């Protein structure tokens, strides 16, 4: 198979509006934020503007192909694929995607989608000018799929740090921590899984 | 062949969502920025806003036709073509495309796409009012393709397209290519680094 055949086969068989569950088992989605910049901290209104790469991975076995005499991966536009309906529960602006809207699909059906995103959050920005700094918490999970349809997990790799973060920002990253949760609301009798990402940062100097 | 036939043939055979590789060779993409303006240097949050023409060329020999008693080129909307997924790795705003989203296709299969783009970057702007000025570095590469699928090469300095009405002036523009291989993975990752050295006018 060439890339044209691979893509053709993806178009046949991929349903962008149908969650790829296999036996009523949830679709396991992993999410990791790589922070690139912190752009406007508003001390007065507790608002922050962040740029981050949102590394999101999951499996969709409908996409799989036989990788003998064939490419092991392809880039496919996200409008041809199902993508998890992740949202930052505490965002106060629409996520602005800065990068080409393509995902990388592997022959086994593993999908990686990593948009660079600019987005505004309401978070506690008192302490940003101190040594311990401030913490912005970003809570990400599925907007419409509860825990039997989508599970969300952090990645195993807090083995990095600020290599990704712009040397030119007024701010520096002290630490990033990831906690997984599942919360139940008064609206909805089942639980929604989220990752809470904590961005500990401070003004330089 | 008339332009209708040319475009028809492009629609048959061009797949906007399939990289036009050809015998597992990468698609060789060349990229050059021509700076038109520098709009807001923000001393408070180290940011600059630039306008530039992003001259991008590559080949897709599937598109080629016989140019005897025929047009040698056509303008085709980019939604009919595969375009490389280039990004400024260090951009902090979505690229705003100012110009019609059309590319030129030549009879040999060469494609030229040159949007005028406005975009924001993080850069150290403290020395912009000095004689040596400041430098904005823009790192461009494929967002999802490694070097065996898409290769990227630069094609320096000129002020030819720069607005004489900008508060700023261009001292220099340099373009280097970077190619890295990591121990995990046998493929190389390529980017073009563009350095824009500029200062406030006297």
């Amino acid at each position: 198979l060439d890339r044209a055949d691979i893509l053709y086969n993806i178009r046949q068989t991929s349903r962008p509006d149908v969650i790829p569950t296999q036996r009523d088992r949830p679709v396991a989605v992993s999410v990791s934020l790589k922070f690139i910049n912190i752009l406007e901290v508003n001390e007065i209104t507790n608002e922050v503007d962040v740029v981050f790469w949102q590394q999101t991975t999951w499996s969709d076995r409908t996409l799989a192909w036989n990788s003998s005499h064939s490419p092991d991966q392809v880039s496919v536009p996200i409008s041809s694929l199902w993508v998890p309906d992740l949202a930052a529960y505490n965002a106060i602006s629409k996520p602005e995607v800065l990068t080409p809207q393509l995902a990388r699909v592997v022959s086994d059906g593993e999908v990686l989608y990593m948009p660079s995103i600019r987005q505004r959050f309401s978070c506690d920005v008192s302490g940003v000018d101190t040594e311990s700094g401030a913490t912005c918490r970003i809570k990400i999970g599925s907007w419409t799929h509860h825990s039997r349809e989508i599970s969300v997990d952090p990645t195993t790799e807090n083995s990095d740090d600020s290599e990704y973060f712009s040397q030119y920002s007024r701010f520096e990253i002290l630490d990033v921590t990831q906690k997984k949760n599942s919360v139940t609301y008064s609206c909805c009798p089942e639980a929604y899984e989220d990752v809470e990402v904590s961005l500990n940062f401070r003004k330089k100097g | 062949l008339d332009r209708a036939d040319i475009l028809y043939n492009i629609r048959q055979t061009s797949r906007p969502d399939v990289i036009p590789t050809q015998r597992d060779r990468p698609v060789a993409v060349s990229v050059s920025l021509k700076f038109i303006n520098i709009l807001e240097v923000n001393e408070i949050t180290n940011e600059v806003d630039v306008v530039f023409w992003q001259q991008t060329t590559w080949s897709d020999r599937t598109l080629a036709w016989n140019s005897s008693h025929s047009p040698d080129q056509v303008s085709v909307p980019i939604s009919s073509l595969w375009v490389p997924d280039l990004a400024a790795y260090n951009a902090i705003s979505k690229p705003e495309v100012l110009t019609p989203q059309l590319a030129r296709v030549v009879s040999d299969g060469e494609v030229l796409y040159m949007p005028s783009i406005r975009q924001r970057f993080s850069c150290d702007v403290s020395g912009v009012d000095t004689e040596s000025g400041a430098t904005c570095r823009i790192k461009i590469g494929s967002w999802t393709h490694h070097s065996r699928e898409i290769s990227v090469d630069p094609t320096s300095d000129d002020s030819e397209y720069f607005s004489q009405y900008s508060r700023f002036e261009i001292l220099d523009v340099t373009q280097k290519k970077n190619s890295v291989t990591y121990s995990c993975c046998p493929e190389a990752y390529e980017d073009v680094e563009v350095s824009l050295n500029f200062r406030k006018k006297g």
Binding site: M114, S159 | C185
Partner: peptide
């Protein structure tokens, strides 16, 4: 890989 370059992160997840 895991790290650093966007395209490398795509092709070798982490």
């Amino acid at each position: 890989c895991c790290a650093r370059n966007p395209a490398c992160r795509h092709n070798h997840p982490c």
